[PDB]
């Protein structure tokens, strides 16, 4: 449910 692409970066 919470594993999708959110545009997050390091």
């Amino acid at each position, epitope marked *: *449910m*919470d*594993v*999708f*692409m*959110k*545009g*997050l*970066s*390091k």
Partner: antibody, heavy 113, light 109 residues
Framework: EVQLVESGGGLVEPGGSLRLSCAVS????????MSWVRQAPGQGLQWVAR??????????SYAAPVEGRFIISRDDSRNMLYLQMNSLKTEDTAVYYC????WGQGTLVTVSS | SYELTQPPSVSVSPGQTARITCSGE??????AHWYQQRPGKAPVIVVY???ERPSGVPERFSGSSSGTTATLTITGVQAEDEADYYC???????????FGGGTKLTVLS
């Protein structure tokens, strides 16, 4: 559990157009950065296009072989992703996948006279 | 323009350990993700954001990432792990997505 279902693939002639649709369920589609990725027979995966979340500006990005011919768009109200494909070439023949870490089953696009 | 480099093939014996590498310039600033793709099926994620294990993925699959290399480790390899494995990461500006070339894993004997 998550599921993505693509539809709209089929046979179209070079120069033609097609519209692919993807229904998403099981995660917060509103926040998702969504991509199309394609796979020609026996080849590797090739990223096609991405659209950010509306809250992040909804910015579209395209792979260079398709830039200017294809248009990715989203409809948050219906949890739908779309790929509008134009001026299609035989080299665009592939299975088209809708993906945001998870993957749909794909839809077969055949470009042929 | 940005490319992720992945060995075309890796072969291992059942029960020993496979390491699949994915090398890219922007990996210090962008997450890598790993997908297994079985013959005739769609990719399924096995590593999310460098090192997180998606739910239902077996414990033998794990990832890590440091510097310009992300690595997928499969411990106690089985015959069932034969498949193509892809890494994915965006470019340094996070404007476009890039896939590795894929790695075909073959289980010997």
């Amino acid at each position: 559990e998550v599921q993505l279902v693509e539809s709209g693939g089929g046979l179209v002639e070079p120069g033609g157009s097609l519209r692919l649709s993807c229904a998403v369920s099981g995660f917060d589609f509103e926040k998702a950065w969504m991509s199309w990725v394609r796979q020609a027979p026996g080849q590797g995966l090739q990223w096609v296009a991405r659209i950010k979340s509306t809250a992040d500006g909804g910015t579209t990005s395209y792979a260079a072989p398709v830039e200017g011919r294809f248009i990715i768009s989203r409809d948050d109200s219906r949890n739908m992703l779309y790929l509008q494909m134009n001026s299609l070439k035989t080299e665009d023949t592939a299975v088209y996948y809708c993906t945001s870490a998870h993957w749909g089953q794909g839809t077969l696009v055949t470009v042929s006279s | 323009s940005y490319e992720l480099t992945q060995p075309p093939s890796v072969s291992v014996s059942p029960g020993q350990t496979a390491r699949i590498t994915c090398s890219g310039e922007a990996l210090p600033m962008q997450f890598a993700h790993w997908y297994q793709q079985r013959p005739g099926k769609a990719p399924v994620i096995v590593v999310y954001k460098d090192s997180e294990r998606p739910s239902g993925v077996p414990e033998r699959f794990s990832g890590s990432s440091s510097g310009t290399t992300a690595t997928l480790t499969i411990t106690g390899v089985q015959a069932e792990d034969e498949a193509d494995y892809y890494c994915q990461s965006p470019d340094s500006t996070n404007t476009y997505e890039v896939f590795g070339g894929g790695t075909k894993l073959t289980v010997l004997s």
